[PDB]
Every structure is written in structure tokens, then in C-alpha cells.
Amino acid sequence: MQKRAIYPGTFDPITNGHIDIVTRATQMFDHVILAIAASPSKKPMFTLEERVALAQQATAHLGNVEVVGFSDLMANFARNQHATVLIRGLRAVADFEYEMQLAHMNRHLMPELESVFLMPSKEWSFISSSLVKEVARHQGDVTHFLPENVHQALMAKLAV
Amino acid sequence: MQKRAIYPGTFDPITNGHIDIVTRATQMFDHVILAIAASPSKKPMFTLEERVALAQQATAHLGNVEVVGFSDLMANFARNQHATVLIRGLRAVADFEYEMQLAHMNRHLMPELESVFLMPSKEWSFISSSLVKEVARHQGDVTHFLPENVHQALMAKLAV
Amino acid sequence: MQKRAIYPGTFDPITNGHIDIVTRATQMFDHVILAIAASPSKKPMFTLEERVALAQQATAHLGNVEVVGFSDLMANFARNQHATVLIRGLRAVADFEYEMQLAHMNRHLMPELESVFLMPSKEWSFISSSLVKEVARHQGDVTHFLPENVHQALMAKLAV
Amino acid sequence: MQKRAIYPGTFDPITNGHIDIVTRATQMFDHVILAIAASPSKKPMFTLEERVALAQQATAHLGNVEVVGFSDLMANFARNQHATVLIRGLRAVADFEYEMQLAHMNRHLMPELESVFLMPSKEWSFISSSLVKEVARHQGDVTHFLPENVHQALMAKLAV
Amino acid sequence: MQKRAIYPGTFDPITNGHIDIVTRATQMFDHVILAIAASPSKKPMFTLEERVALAQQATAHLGNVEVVGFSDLMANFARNQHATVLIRGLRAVADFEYEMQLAHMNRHLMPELESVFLMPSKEWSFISSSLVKEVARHQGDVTHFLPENVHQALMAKLAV
Amino acid sequence: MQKRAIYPGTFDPITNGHIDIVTRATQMFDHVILAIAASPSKKPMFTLEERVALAQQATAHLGNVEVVGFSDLMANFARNQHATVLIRGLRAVADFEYEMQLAHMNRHLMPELESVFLMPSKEWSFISSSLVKEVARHQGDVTHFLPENVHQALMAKLAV
Ligand SMILES: COc1ccc(Oc2cccc([C@@H](C)Nc3nc4n(n3)C(=O)CC(C)=N4)c2)cc1
Numbered sequence: 001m002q003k004r005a006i007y008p009g010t011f012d013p014i015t016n017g018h019i020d021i022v023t024r025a026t027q028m029f030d031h032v033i034l035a036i037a038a039s040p041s042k043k044p045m046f047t048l049e050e051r052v053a054l055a056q057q058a059t060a061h062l063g064n065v066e067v068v069g070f071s072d073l074m075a076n077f078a079r080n081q082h083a084t085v086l087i088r089g090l091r092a093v094a095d096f097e098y099e100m101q102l103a104h105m106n107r108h109l110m111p112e113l114e115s116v117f118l119m120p121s122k123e124w125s126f127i128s129s130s131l132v133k134e135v136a137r138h139q140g141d142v143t144h145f146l147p148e149n150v151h152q153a154l155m156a157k158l159a160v
Numbered sequence: 161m162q163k164r165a166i167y168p169g170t171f172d173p174i175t176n177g178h179i180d181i182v183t184r185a186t187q188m189f190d191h192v193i194l195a196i197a198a199s200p201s202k203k204p205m206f207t208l209e210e211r212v213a214l215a216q217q218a219t220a221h222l223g224n225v226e227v228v229g230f231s232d233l234m235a236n237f238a239r240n241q242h243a244t245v246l247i248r249g250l251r252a253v254a255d256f257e258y259e260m261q262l263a264h265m266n267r268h269l270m271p272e273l274e275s276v277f278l279m280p281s282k283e284w285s286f287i288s289s290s291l292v293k294e295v296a297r298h299q300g301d302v303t304h305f306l307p308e309n310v311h312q313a314l315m316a317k318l319a320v
Numbered sequence: 321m322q323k324r325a326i327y328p329g330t331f332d333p334i335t336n337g338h339i340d341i342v343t344r345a346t347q348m349f350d351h352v353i354l355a356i357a358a359s360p361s362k363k364p365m366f367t368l369e370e371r372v373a374l375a376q377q378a379t380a381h382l383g384n385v386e387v388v389g390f391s392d393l394m395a396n397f398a399r400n401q402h403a404t405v406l407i408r409g410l411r412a413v414a415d416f417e418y419e420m421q422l423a424h425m426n427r428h429l430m431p432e433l434e435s436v437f438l439m440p441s442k443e444w445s446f447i448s449s450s451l452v453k454e455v456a457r458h459q460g461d462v463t464h465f466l467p468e469n470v471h472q473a474l475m476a477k478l479a480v
Numbered sequence: 481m482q483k484r485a486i487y488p489g490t491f492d493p494i495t496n497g498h499i500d501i502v503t504r505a506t507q508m509f510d511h512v513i514l515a516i517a518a519s520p521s522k523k524p525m526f527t528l529e530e531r532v533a534l535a536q537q538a539t540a541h542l543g544n545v546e547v548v549g550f551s552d553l554m555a556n557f558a559r560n561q562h563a564t565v566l567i568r569g570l571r572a573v574a575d576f577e578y579e580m581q582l583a584h585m586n587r588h589l590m591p592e593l594e595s596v597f598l599m600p601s602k603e604w605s606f607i608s609s610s611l612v613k614e615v616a617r618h619q620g621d622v623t624h625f626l627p628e629n630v631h632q633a634l635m636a637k638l639a640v
Numbered sequence: 641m642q643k644r645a646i647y648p649g650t651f652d653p654i655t656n657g658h659i660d661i662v663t664r665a666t667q668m669f670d671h672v673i674l675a676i677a678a679s680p681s682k683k684p685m686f687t688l689e690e691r692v693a694l695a696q697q698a699t700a701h702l703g704n705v706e707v708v709g710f711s712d713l714m715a716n717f718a719r720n721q722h723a724t725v726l727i728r729g730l731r732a733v734a735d736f737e738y739e740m741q742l743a744h745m746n747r748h749l750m751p752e753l754e755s756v757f758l759m760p761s762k763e764w765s766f767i768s769s770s771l772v773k774e775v776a777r778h779q780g781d782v783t784h785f786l787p788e789n790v791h792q793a794l795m796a797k798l799a800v
Numbered sequence: 801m802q803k804r805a806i807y808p809g810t811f812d813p814i815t816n817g818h819i820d821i822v823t824r825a826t827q828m829f830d831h832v833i834l835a836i837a838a839s840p841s842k843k844p845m846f847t848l849e850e851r852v853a854l855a856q857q858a859t860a861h862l863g864n865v866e867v868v869g870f871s872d873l874m875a876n877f878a879r880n881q882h883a884t885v886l887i888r889g890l891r892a893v894a895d896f897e898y899e900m901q902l903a904h905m906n907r908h909l910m911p912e913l914e915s916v917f918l919m920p921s922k923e924w925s926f927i928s929s930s931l932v933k934e935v936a937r938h939q940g941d942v943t944h945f946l947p948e949n950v951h952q953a954l955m956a957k958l959a960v
Pocket residue numbers: 008009010037038039070071072073074075088099102103105106294295298
């Protein structure tokens with residue numbers, strides 16, 4: 001069906017939970033666009049360029065992933081990427097309720113973009129980019145939760 | 161029973177979800193005070209005066225609605241408006257849990273002010289003022305979710 | 321106003337949580353119909369005649385409560401009773417989810433019947449007729465959760 | 481791709497919510513197996529032969545749907561059918577919790593079967609086969625929630 | 641300290657999730673009573689004598705565990721056993737809601753019994769005795785979720 | 801078992817809900833460290849020194865409580881305090897979901913630190929330090945929710 005899926009988010013930084021979801025998406029769809037939202041208003045730890053480079057390196061082993069950045073309305077960027085599948089990761093109820101609101105909003109903005117929720121391994125079901133950054137800024141060991149390239153970049157960013 | 165109900169919130173800006181709730185309240189109670197909290201600390205998109213004017217225009221077709229602004233403790237403002245009914249809208253679990261805490265707190269502050277939860281149409285069960293503003297600031301079409309006067313005011317506010 | 325409200329359920333048996341909710345309803349509506357479903361509850365410990373007599377005695381002090389048995393679809397009975405307000409009690413998240421489904425269904429069946437959710441005192445926010453029956457059947461003290469007449473009828477029921 | 485997806489359940493009876501989910505699945509996968517469990521549902525109102533015939537007629541317009549009965553563990557049937565995608569529908573939080581448990585269990589049983597959660601239209605986000613049956617058995621109108629053939633079979637079933 | 645803790649349930653059958661919770665309890669309290677309810681579970685697959693023998697063998701390596709059958713209200717048995725700590729396991733939101741209701745009820749029945757909630761490993765955070773039984777009865781592999789003796793008894797039970 | 805428990809948080813300011821939890825912990829464990837996180841990035845109302853002094857005065861009647869401040873990773877501070885028990889308070893689902901993520905993270909950081917959740921009285925099940933501060937800054941009466949010393953300090957802080 002030459003299916004194109006988009007997996008959007010801030011990925012600040014991309015975690016093993018995100019790698020898990022994008023890997024599951026590549027096994028299901030022909031082409032996956034991992035889309036990184038700039039979102040400067042949220043004051044990200046890494047620049048958009050840094051996040052794109054980290055995600056490209058962390059997904060280099062998957063042949064059907066394309067990493068790109070965007071500052072647009074996500075649904076407009078998905079239409080412009082010719083995506084018909086919108087990948088979401090399902091971890092907690094609080095995330096699920098907010099994802100339900102976003103999916104109904106995205107369906108009003110682009111009805112042909114089908115929201116699909118994938119479930120990560122139990123190993124990453126309790127992690128987030130925010131939680132990993134919080135632990136790391138207090139010098140806690142987060143090597144288990146991030147791709148090697150990302151872990152070294154996070155340590156460097158926090159070292160000033 | 162000459163019942164007076166208060167429907168408080170930031171209404172920044174008032175949405176079709178809020179119009180739905182206030183319409184249901186006017187069919188049940190003799191007089192409904194739609195109470196707009198100034199809350200400058202939360203940095204609202206619209207000034208309190210702008211929110212009051214938008215809500216007055218959006219509820220002008222309902223004869224038993226009175227739009228007012230407040231900066232007081234909500235329960236003190238409700239007592240001062242002679243309200244005995246406190247209208248809340250019920251959409252998601254995250255909102256419900258926080259509304260439960262506020263209702264127990266409001267009952268300690270003013271036990272005769274009865275919290276009543278009304279449920280909006282399925283059409284507005286996944287929207288919020290925050291979500292509409294987020295979509296609009298990324299140029300997404302939010303005409304369906306707001307009264308006409310509000311939609312034009314929101315576009316003007318974002319146009320700088 | 322001259323609002324007619326209906327508060328339906330199995331009330332098997334009526335608890336202090338139900339008395340709390342029906343009391344709050346009588347403070348805001350002119351007439352409250354406490355509607356007892358003829359259908360068996362998940363138990364069903366008390367017969368309809370027992371449930372009606374217990375509810376009548378336990379609400380006798382409330383001048384604007386009418387206790388009535390019904391066997392139809394609740395909305396069909398609410399319609400024939402000219403009720404325009406449907407009282408529901410909200411204790412927790414599990415309650416909320418199921419009550420939201422029922423409220424959207426009741427609105428489809430009878431749109432002129434408005435669902436209103438009231439919150440009981442913290443005192444009764446963790447009880448149900450089911451829990452009370454399980455504890456009492458297993459020789460636990462439930463005196464605090466019931467009107468005196470219900471406590472007497474429950475002891476009589478468990479003795480035989 | 482040539483992806484084979486399975487959408488299992490009791491479908492007792494198949495509703496407009498199930499038609500919505502199976503339609504979305506046919507738009508993203510080459511072949512969709514709508515798998516009907518031989519096991520009784522919490523009711524079980526319609527026999528397996530009735531459930532299959534109703535689902536076949538209600539999905540006849542979808543060229544890539546195959547309606548099939550099964551009695552094994554769902555994952556055992558998905559495995560023998562060479563399905564690599566497992567379609568689930570997500571309506572609310574109560575659904576989510578139980579579906580998460582089942583998805584982790586299905587991944588343990590058949591890791592090559594990827595669980596995918598789709599969201600139905602807001603129109604069907606508050607219905608289930610169970611709720612439809614309870615309303616219809618109690619003389620309530622459920623026409624809007626069902627395909628025409630199912631509505632006809634349900635009236636015939638309740639008449640006898 | 642000399643704290644006596646009680647960990648009650650049907651344990652039909654005892655799983656690796658229950659072993660995980662009882663092990664954590666033995667690491668913090670001097671004596672742990674693993675209390676098996678004589679009452680049938682939603683199934684009830686194993687008889688009380690089978691449930692006790694299985695739990696005894698599966699906890700034999702833990703020196704401070706005492707496996708005991710009971711038929712009374714749990715709090716009545718905890719009281720007579722001089723337990724001051726009541727062990728509960730928390731896996732998900734559905735568990736949490738019901739456990740909160742039970743904990744407030746147990747505190748009313750026996751205030752000197754303190755409810756303590758422990759979290760199992762992520763490995764067992766999505767299993768229950770009910771789910772294990774449904775999968776095994778339908779010819780699914782549940783070996784990973786059970787102690788070896790329980791796995792052997794379950795195969796023997798399903799064979800006849 | 802000479803058990804040492806740590807009860808960490810921002811306690812900005814310590815409430816009657818926190819006093820309830822720490823009192824339950826002192827009845828179960830030999831020594832309880834009430835650990836106050838500095839967290840200057842969150843812009844606390846009270847300085848770390850003020851929070852420590854308020855908590856010491858509010859827990860002076862409990863002989864086995866030690867109040868200390870920390871700016872470290874919480875798990876490292878717990879190891880350095882020789883704690884093997886981590887006290888958490890369980891009020892709402894939103895808190896529970898976040899507490900589940902923190903407990904799995906804390907278990908990866910310090911597996912021998914056992915997270916234990918205690919449930920406060922129904923009286924404090926709907927309060928938080930944030931909610932009390934919000935009500936107080938709008939001049940609402942919060943005397944019921946705080947120890948006397950804390951209430952007077954909060955009034956003084958808000959009086960400028
Ligand atoms: C499931 O819905 C998603 C998923 C990921 C998304 O990625 C991000 C993350 C941060 C910032 C942005 C910015 C650049 N654009 C954007 N587009 C939106 N935004 N924000 C909303 O707030 C709501 C909405 C429906 N569409 C996008 C956006 C929406």
C-alpha cells in the first residue's frame with residue numbers, strides 16, 4: 001500500500017522508548033518520518049539541529065526512517081510529508097487522555113491521517129525525556145534509557 | 161426556588177464547549193453568572209475586559225446569563241453573587257480528579273455552594289481553550305470550536 | 321423553576337452516601353423522585369418492596385422527596401414522570417467513566433433530560449451498596465454507613 | 481507491505497463502533513481478518529453463526545475484510561493466520577487499562593504480532609455491545625448505533 | 641520493631657507477581673502472614689487446600705513467611721493475628737481505585753491495621769491470577785508468570 | 801529490623817496531609833527521615849531553611865522523626881541516609897501514575913530502597929501544598945489544612 005507514517009514529537013532528547021516505538025513502526029510501514037518539533041517556547045535542552053542529528057545517529061540502523069525537523073502545525077507537516085499514518089506511543093493514562101484530545105483535533109485538521117497507538121516494551125513504559133533529564137541533571141545514571149550517542153550528548157550538555 | 165448558579169473559569173477565550181455548558185445551566189437555573197477570573201499570573205492571551213466582552217457577545221442570545229469579571233477567591237465571589245449552585249463542566253479524568261479536589265476545597269470554603277457537574281456534547285468533549293490556542297498559533301483552522309466573535313478576536317490577537 | 325429531578329438506582333440497600341446525594345438534590349430542585357429499579361442488583365439482597373420501604377423511611381424527613389419503584393428503561397420512566405434533571409453521584413474515576421457512557425446514552429434516548437453530577441461528602445466517597453453488603457455478609461461492621469432503619473433491616477436479613 | 485491484520489472480539493452484536501474501527505483498519509492494511517470468538521460474551525445474545533452472518537453483511541462493502549470464526553486463544557489463531565498486526569479500538573481509560581494488560585500478554589504469547597490501537601469517531605466513543613444490549617433489552621432505542629441488518633436481527637431476537 | 645504483616649488474597653493460583661510482593665514484604669517486616677481466603681475467586685480453579693500447598697512450596701525459601709487459610713472478614717482475621725501492617729500490591733489505575741475503597745473500609749474496621757502498597761517488578765505489572773487462568777484455559781503459555789510447582793499443578797488441573 | 805525510612809518531597813509548606821503520612825510512617829518504622837528537597841528552579845514559596853524549621857516544629861511531638869534538607873538526587877540522599885524504605889503518600893490517579901514512574905526509576909537507581917505507599921485520612925485526600933497556597937493567596941481560610949506554626953508562617957509570607 002506504499003504507506004508513509006509520521007512519528008512526531010519534541011524528542012528532547014530521543015530515548016530508548018522512542019527508539020522502541022519507531023522500530024515497531026518501521027516493521028509495519030514502508031516509510032517512517034521521525035518528525036522533530038522545534039518548539040523554542042518550551043525552552044528545549046537541545047537545539048532542533050542537535051535533536052535531528054542525535055535521532056539520525058540513533059536510527060541509522062533502520063533503513064526506512066527519515067529524520068526531519070518542523071515548526072509547522074503537525075497535521076500540515078504530515079499532509080506535506082504525504083503521511084496517512086500518525087504514530088503515537090501509549091504509556092500512561094495521563095498521556096492517553098491528552099493523546100485522545102490531540103487525536104480528535106488532528107482528525108478535524110486532517111481526517112485521512114489515521115492516528116495509531118503503539119505500545120512500548122515494559123522496559124520503557126515508565127520513562128519520558130523529561131524524567132530522564134531530571135534524573136541526569138541530579139547526576140543519576142541514565143545510560144540504560146538512552147542510545148549511546150544521546151547519553152554522551154546529554155552528559156556534555158549538563159557539564160556546561 | 162429562584163436559583164442562582166455561578167459558572168467560573170478563565171475563559172481565555174470562551175469556546176463552544178463553554179457555550180454548551182452555560183446553555184445547559186440556563187435551562188436548569190433561573191439565573192446564571194458566567195464569572196471570568198482575571199488570573200494575570202497565568203499570562204492570559206486576552207485581557208479580563210476582552211474576555212468579558214467576548215463572553216457577553218457569545219451569550220447575548222441567552223436571556224438569563226450575566227457575565228462578570230473577578231479577581232477574588234472564587235467561593236467569596238460566589239457568596240457575594242448570592243449563588244448556591246456552582247457549575248463545572250466534565251470532560252476528562254485528569255480534569256475530573258482536579259475538579260474533585262477543588263469541589264472539596266470549595267465545600268470547606270462555602271458549604272452551601274453546591275458543585276454540579278454538567279457534561280458537554282460529544283462534539284466538545286475533547287477541546288479546551290489551551291488546545292484551541294495551541295492549534296491557532298500554529299495557523300490550524302479552529303473556526304468549528306469557537307463562537308464567530310471569539311474566532312475573529314483570536315485571529316486578530318495572533319496576527320500581532 | 322418548578323424543576324422535577326429523578327435520582328435512579330437499585331439502592332440495594334440505600335446508604336448514607338445515597339442520603340447525602342438525595343439531600344443535596346432537594347436543596348436545589350423543587351421535586352426529587354428517588355427511583356428504585358425493580359431489577360436485581362449484582363447481589364440482590366433486598367426485594368423491591370424492602371428497598372422502597374427502607375428508602376421511604378430514610379428520606380421521610382425530606383419533604384420534597386417521592387420514593388417510586390420502576391421496571392422500565394430508566395429514561396422511559398424519567399420521560400413519563402416529566403423529569404428534566406437526572407441526578408448522578410460521583411465518587412471516583414471508575415464511577416466517572418461508566419457514568420459518562422450512561423449520560424451520553426441517556427442524552428441520545430431523552431435529550432430533554434439533563435444529567436447532573438453531585439459529589440457526596442468525603443465521608444461516603446469510598447462506599448457503595450456492593451462494598452457495604454460484602455463487608456456485612458463477611459461479619460464486618462457497617463453501622464456508620466447506613467441509616468438506622470437500614471442497619472436494622474440488614475442485621476435481620478443476614479440473621480436468616 | 482502485504483500486511484495481514486486481525487481484529488478480534490465477540491462482536492455480540494457488531495456495532496457502528498466496530499464498523500468504524502474495521503473501516504480505518506482496511507484503509508491502512510492490505511488484508512483485515514475480522515475474527516469472531518466462538519466463546520459466549522458477558523450476555524451472549526447472538527449465536528456464533530448469527531454473529532458471523534451479521535458481521536459479513538455489515539462489512540460486505542469493504543473488499544479487503546474477511547469475516548472468520550475462531551475458538552482458540554486469540555494469539556494461537558492470529559499465529560496460524562499469519563497476522564502481524566492486531567487491531568484494537570480505544571474509547572476510554574477503562575478500555576486502555578485492560579487493553580494494556582492484554583497487549584503485554586499477547587506480545588509474550590506472539591511477539592511477531594504487533595498490537596495497534598485505533599480511535600473510533602466521537603460518535604461511537606461512548607458505546608459497547610454490552611451497553612447496546614442492556615438498553616435494547618430494557619426497551620430503549622439503539623437504531624443509531626447499529627448497522628441496519630443488526631438492528632433488524634436485534635429486534636427479531638428481542639421479540640422472541 | 642517486631643512488626644507482623646498480613647498479605648491477604650485468594651491467590652488462585654499464586655503467581656510470580658505475588659512472590660515478588662511477598663518477597664519485598666519479608667525484606668521490610670519481621671513476620672509476613674500470606675493469608676489465603678477460603679472463599680472462591682471469580683473462577684475458582686484451585687481448592688483452598690491446593691492454594692495453600694502451592695503457596696507454601698513457592699515461599700518455602702523465605703524464612704519469615706507463614707502461609708495460613710482464613711474464611712472471616714479479612715480485617716477480623718488480621719485483628720486476631722495481631723497484624724499491624726496490611727500488604728497490598730499496586731500494578732495499575734484499576735487496581736488503585738478499588739484498593740483505595742478497600743483501604744478506607746479496612747481502616748474503619750481496624751484502624752490499628754496500616755495499609756501499605758508495594759509495587760511489583762515491571763515484569764509482573766501487567767498480570768493477575770484471572771488473566772493467567774484465562775490464557776492457560778484457552779491453551780496459552782503462562783510458564784513465565786508462575787513458580788515451577790504452580791505451573792505443574794496448573795497443567796495437571798487443565799488436563800482433567 | 802532497625803528500619804530507616806525516608807519521606808522526601810518539597811513540603812512547600814508541609815501540610816496536615818504530610819503530617820498524617822509521616823505519623824503513619826513513624827508507627828511502622830524505627831526511624832523516619834523527613835527529607836526536604838531544596839528545588840530552587842521550581843521557585844518555592846519558602847526557603848529550604850524555612851521549610852526545614854517549619855517541618856521540625858510540626859513534627860517535634862514525634863520522637864523518631866529527623867528533618868533534613870537535600871539538593872542531591874533523592875535516591876543518592878536515601879542511600880547516604882542508610883534508608884531502605886521510601887515513603888510515598890497516595891491521594892489521586894494523576895499522582896499515582898507519576899509516582900509509579902518515579903518508583904520504577906528509583907528502583908533502577910537504588911534497588912534496595914523499597915517504595916511504600918501510605919494512604920492519608922479521607923480528611924486530607926484532596927489537598928496539596930499547591931492548592932493550599934492558591935487558596936491562601938486569594939485570602940481563603942486554610943487554618944484547617946496546616947499545622948498552626950505553618951499556617952502563621954504562610955500568612956506572614958503572603959502579607960509581604
Ligand atoms: C498527537 O498530536 C501531536 C503530536 C506531536 C506534535 O508535535 C509537536 C510538539 C511540540 C510542538 C509542536 C508544534 C511545532 N506544532 C503543533 N502542532 C500541533 N500542536 N503544536 C499542538 O500543540 C496541538 C496540535 C493538534 N497540533 C508540535 C504535535 C501534535
